[PDB]
Ligand binder design. Structure first.
Ligand SMILES: CC(=O)N[C@@H]1[C@@H](O)[C@H](O)[C@@H](CO)O[C@@H]1O
Ligand SMILES: *[C@@H]1O[C@H](CO)[C@@H](O)[C@H](O)[C@H]1NC(C)=O
Ligand SMILES: *[C@@H]1O[C@H](CO)[C@@H](O)[C@H](O)[C@H]1NC(C)=O
Ligand SMILES: *[C@@H]1O[C@H](CO)[C@@H](O)[C@H](O)[C@H]1NC(C)=O
Ligand SMILES: *[C@@H]1O[C@H](CO)[C@@H](O)[C@H](O)[C@H]1NC(C)=O
Ligand SMILES: *[C@@H]1O[C@H](CO)[C@@H](O)[C@H](O)[C@H]1NC(C)=O
Ligand SMILES: *[C@@H]1O[C@H](CO)[C@@H](O)[C@H](O)[C@H]1NC(C)=O
Ligand SMILES: *[C@@H]1O[C@H](CO)[C@@H](O)[C@H](O)[C@H]1NC(C)=O
Ligand SMILES: *[C@@H]1O[C@H](CO)[C@@H](O)[C@H](O)[C@H]1NC(C)=O
Ligand SMILES: *[C@H]1O[C@H](CO)[C@@H](O)[C@H](O)[C@H]1NC(C)=O
Lengths: 474, 328, 66
């Protein structure tokens, strides 16, 4: 709880929390290495101008459902727990034809090791999502990137689109230890012509595969086209398309919610969470108490229903949009949570309960605990931004303190407490709220965490939710 | 010397033979590569011995009836053979063995049918070129246009690759030109290249090397045209590019670079978007016309420079017809 | 004709699409290795009423083909 806030002159474009090193966050053309407490700016990176972090170009933020622009595209720390070898960080930007470099995970004043162009999107408004993993007999470190590399370039001089033979590239595999983070012949997934643009939201590893949540989108028009989907690829040194599948999350809305704002794979659960939304007009007129929604999907059903068909991507066994269409996947009906302005999501499991943190356009940080049927209970409000600043689509958990979560909104990063157990005085009053983080303490007669309470072995002071209120002294 | 498919005989016998499609002698001995029941592999024949080298993709096709092409130069091997059977429908010219693997992009050829390839040593070693001949679809789709056209392509032997992550592994010096063999007197065109034969000059001047091409047309009539490496190279370094009407990039498309420098992105993109040079490669000497044409359907050519008893020198052509005969 | 209309026509007199033969498969009625120079056609009815088009062609050898 409360304000070890960090401020920036420019809006935040990305944020990634390292394990043993600070919290990294990119504002404009700069990247800052912040202390976990968000106190000091240990190191800073001036990517474009020598001392200016100011946006070289002005980006006008569209409708909130509509995706925003940014100069940073990738911020991926990896190779952390090596013991003997330091950690590494991938930093990708629109600059230098969507370049990306490999830097040491730490002092941003050090020189990069390797770098390559055309790794990520060179367009401020273009999507880019990637993930690192290891493959091959050498067990080399690879980067699987999905981006919107091609957008119409009006400016006849600042043209940065890749070559004509790479114009249909959707996802590419980069060898992090090679010449320009090279992509080989078989290292890419190609777009189907006419499918327009694809907006990639996230990229993650699951069951030996890499998944890419995305949705067709017209950047010029500013409107979504088809259904939000997910692309599935093998964790290999070569691209091996394993399927595509649509995600239906238009429950309480007529035309549906064909926009995906946030993505989060619940680790030890094999379930994926995403915040969907329909169009809120061109301004913010069509706003409704049902415009947004939180949907949970079973990764198993996502894998099973994703077929190697040619719809958004090219295949050797068929022509674009000629065979069968992609199968739609239904979310876990019990988990669905309709809302008017959800913008972010993050999920994990504490004791054995699944906790979901949600961000809003009004600056709120919600929290829902799923029941036995994974049913969604009424969301509790943990924090509220005084300025009502919309929450960044990414909610990063604190790797050092399990009791904290980094909330990012506009130009600020705050270290919010996962839950405020001090709001409950009575033992029964607390253990009935069903919060895996909160537990009554039979020491100072108050409800707190296992760390705040002397979790002795002789006298079991801390009482969990596993037992319920049917154990309190009363 | 049986080199049976004895490396995994097929259940449900159909066509799992080991067709030997390649024979090349190296310092290690005679290299022999085959289909090996759809499992491309090579063997070495040294001293009455048959030593297997195992699976070597790109050295042999999966099926004998495939349009194959492999070239050897030093310790570098080039091939037009796909490395995997579930590969796309895009044929490529690849460097299979060398410093790094390079492959031609999706934009440079449209359903190519390879005929022949050769290394061409120019003035400086780093200017060495790889030239190869082939037929492909005609970019011109008008109803009166002929369906396929004949080409010669060039690549810099010392091509490093590109500057970006996507272009590193691609050939960055590809350029192609249409090969024209038409009679001046009559208006007769022979657009279908059948075979090429190279004849170096006695002078040792690469620029004087002759390229003899045999061409046919829709009626299966034929003509033989002769070109010079010099004329082809001049087309490659002086012609503008079809569809590109602005000043070309400083390091010119298709031009080799000195000290292992990769081709600049600005140069590669022009080349990758406009790989055809606008000017055609025509026959040698004044009156760019065929040596001769006839109503026979020729498929292969070989040339022998010889001296007559009285010291006179003549070039004698050996042509196979599609009737199983040879014409001198 | 308006000047603006005439100037486009005067600079670009050739239309882009080609005129191809009649019906599906825009192909010739037939072709041969003979050198034909003139043609005249007669639509006619056979004894049983069937209609036939008969072409008369001259070769450069002074003969006529039916
Ligand atoms: C023998 C050969 O390959 N020549 C072909 C032949 O198949 C075909 O009958 C002829 C007709 O013009 O075109 C040519
Ligand atoms: C980062 O490195 C620079 C130069 O090596 C050094 O001056 C600076 O103090 C380092 N940052 C911190 C706070 O350790
Ligand atoms: C950097 O700051 C200067 C003023 O100090 C400003 O003129 C410039 O626009 C800034 N950089 C850019 C290109 O945004
Ligand atoms: C990027 O890496 C190359 C090596 O491939 C190096 O020569 C070049 O100087 C680097 N450029 C940057 C961004 O420092
Ligand atoms: C995208 O929107 C622009 C602007 O409305 C339009 O010109 C274009 O046709 C759209 N793209 C397609 C074909 O969906
Ligand atoms: C993981 O992938 C394998 C396919 O290789 C599949 O058999 C298995 O069912 C998957 N696991 C789950 C939970 O779907
Ligand atoms: C934990 O919860 C999950 C889902 O609610 C359930 O499937 C699992 O059995 C529970 N763990 C145990 C062993 O009780
Ligand atoms: C849903 O909850 C009921 C009662 O709490 C339980 O019996 C049932 O097994 C749950 N559903 C599943 C399959 O977990
Ligand atoms: C074949 O001859 C070469 C050179 O004479 C020799 O090195 C090689 O050992 C011989 N092969 C065998 C296995 O006898
Ligand atoms: C052009 O002609 C060649 C040989 O006659 C043939 O193999 C090829 O398929 C033709 N092109 C197409 C696509 O029709």
């Amino acid at each position: 709880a409360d304000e070890p806030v960090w401020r920036s002159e420019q809006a935040i474009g990305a944020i990634a929390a390292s394990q043993e090193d600070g919290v990294f966050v990119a504002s404009g053309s700069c990247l800052d290495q912040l202390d976990y407490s968000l106190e000091h700016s240990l190191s800073r990176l001036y990517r474009d101008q020598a001392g200016n972090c100011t946006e070289p170009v002005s980006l006008a933020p569209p409708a909130r459902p509509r995706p925003g622009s940014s100069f940073s595209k990738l911020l991926l720390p990896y190779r952390e727990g090596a013991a003997g070898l330091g950690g590494l960080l991938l930093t990708g930007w629109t600059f230098d034809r969507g370049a990306c470099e490999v830097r040491p995970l730490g002092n941003l004043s050090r020189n990069s090791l390797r770098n390559g162009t055309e790794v990520v999107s060179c367009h401020p408004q273009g999507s880019t999502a990637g993930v690192v993993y290891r493959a091959g007999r050498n067990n080399r470190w690879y980067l699987a990137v999905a981006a919107t590399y091609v957008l119409p370039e009006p400016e006849t001089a600042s043209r940065c689109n890749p070559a004509a033979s790479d114009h249909d590239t959707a996802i590419a595999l980069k060898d992090t230890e090679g010449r320009s983070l090279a992509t080989q012949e078989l290292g890419r997934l190609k777009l189907c012509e006419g499918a327009g643009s694809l907006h990639f939201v996230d990229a993650f590893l699951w069951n030996g595969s890499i998944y890419f949540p995305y949705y067709p989108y017209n950047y010029t028009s500013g409107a979504a086209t088809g259904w939000p989907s997910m692309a599935r690829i093998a964790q290999s040194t070569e691209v091996l398309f394993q399927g595509q599948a649509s995600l239906d999350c238009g429950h309480g809305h007529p035309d549906g919610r064909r926009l995906l704002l946030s993505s989060s794979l619940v680790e030890a659960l094999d379930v994926w969470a995403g915040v969907f939304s329909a169009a809120a007009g061109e301004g913010q007129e069509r706003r409704s108490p049902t415009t947004t929604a939180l949907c949970l999907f079973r990764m198993s059903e996502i894998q099973a229903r994703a077929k190697r068909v040619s719809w958004d991507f090219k295949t050797a066994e068929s022509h674009c949009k000629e065979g069968d269409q992609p199968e739609r996947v239904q979310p876990i009906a019990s988990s669905t949570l309709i809302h008017s302005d959800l913008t972010s999501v993050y999920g994990t499991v504490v004791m054995n309960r699944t906790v979901l943190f949600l961000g809003t356009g009004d600056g709120q940080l919600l929290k829902v605990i799923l029941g036995e049927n994974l049913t969604s209970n009424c969301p509790e409000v943990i924090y509220e931004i005084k300025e009502e600043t919309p929450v960044f689509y990414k909610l990063v958990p604190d790797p050092v303190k399990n009791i904290y979560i980094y909330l990012t909104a506009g130009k600020e990063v705050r270290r919010i407490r996962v839950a405020n157990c001090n709001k409950h005085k009575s033992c029964s009053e607390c253990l009935t709220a069903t919060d895996p983080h909160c537990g009554w303490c039979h020491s100072l007669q108050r409800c707190t965490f296992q760390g705040d309470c002397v979790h002795s072995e002789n006298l079991e002071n801390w009482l969990d939710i596993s037992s319920g209120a049917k154990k309190c002294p009363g | 010397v049986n080199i049976g498919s004895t490396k995994g005989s097929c259940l449900d016998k159909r066509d799992c033979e080991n067709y030997i499609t390649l024979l090349e002698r190296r310092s290690e001995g005679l290299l022999a590569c085959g289909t090996n029941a759809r499992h491309p592999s090579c063997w070495n024949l040294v001293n009455g011995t048959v030593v297997p080298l195992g699976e070597m993709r790109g050295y042999a096709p999966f099926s004998p009836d495939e349009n194959s092409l492999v070239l050897f130069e030093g310790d570098e091997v080039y091939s037009t053979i796909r490395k995997q059977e579930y590969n796309g429908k895009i044929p490529r010219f690849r460097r299979i063995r060398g410093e790094s693997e390079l492959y031609t992009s999706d934009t440079v050829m449209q359903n190519p049918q390879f005929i022949k390839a050769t290394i061409v040593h120019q003035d400086q070693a780093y200017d060495d070129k790889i030239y190869y001949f082939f037929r492909e679809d005609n970019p011109d789709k008008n109803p009166e246009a002929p369906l396929n056209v004949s080409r010669v392509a060039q690549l810099c032997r010392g091509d490093q690759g590109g500057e970006s992550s996507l272009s590193v592994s691609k050939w960055n010096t590809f350029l192609k030109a249409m090969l024209v063999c038409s009679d001046a007197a009559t208006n007769k065109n022979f657009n279908r290249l059948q075979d090429v034969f190279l004849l170096p000059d006695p002078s040792g001047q690469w620029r004087d090397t002759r390229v003899y091409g045999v061409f046919s047309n829709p009626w299966n009539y034929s003509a033989v045209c002769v070109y010079s490496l010099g004329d082809i190279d001049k087309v490659f370094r002086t012609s503008s590019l079809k569809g590109y009407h602005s000043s070309l990039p400083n390091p010119r498309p298709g031009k080799c670079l000195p000290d292992q420098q990769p081709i600049p992105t600005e140069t590669f993109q022009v080349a990758d978007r406009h790989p055809e040079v606008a000017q055609r490669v025509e026959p040698m000497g004044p009156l760019k016309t065929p040596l001769f044409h006839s109503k026979y359907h020729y498929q292969k050519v070989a040339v022998h420079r010889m001296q007559a008893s009285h010291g006179e020198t003549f070039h004698v052509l050996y042509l196979t017809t599609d009737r199983g005969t040879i014409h001198k």
